[PDB]
């Protein structure tokens, strides 16, 4: 999770399910950031992977889900318009000169 946060993703949740301690099985998950669970923008905005790890007691399942930033290849920066989510891009406001007289060259 710390890696994914340092990777630049704005959210990740991982779940390890099965036997971790004892005869019975626990489903233990950690989630941080944001994560959409519904709608279309879960295919092109969330990456999900399911894997299995064997153990002397049994099999542990690992589910990793990651959010992706806005612009492709991990948020390089704004490019040709391909809008996919809501954003408020606030530019720098115009500034007027304080001096009563205008610029002289």
């Amino acid at each position: 999770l710390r890696f994914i946060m340092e990777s630049g993703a704005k959210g990740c949740e991982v779940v390890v399910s099965g036997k971790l301690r004892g005869q019975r099985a626990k489903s233990m998950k950690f989630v941080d950031g944001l994560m959409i669970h519904s709608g279309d923008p879960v295919n092109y905005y969330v990456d999900t992977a399911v894997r299995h790890v064997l153990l002397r007691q049994g099999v542990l399942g690992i589910k990793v889900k990651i959010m992706l930033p806005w612009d492709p290849t991990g948020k390089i920066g704004p490019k040709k318009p391909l809008p996919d989510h809501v954003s408020i891009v606030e530019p720098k406001d115009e500034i007027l000169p304080t001096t009563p007289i205008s610029e002289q060259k």
Binding site: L20, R21, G22, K26
Partner: peptide
Amino acid sequence: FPYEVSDALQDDPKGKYSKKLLNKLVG
């Protein structure tokens, strides 16, 4: 901070080993 006993306790806070794990966590 030791996490092994913390996980063992968090799996079952009132199990057979709850007293020993809680005691080990105290100090």
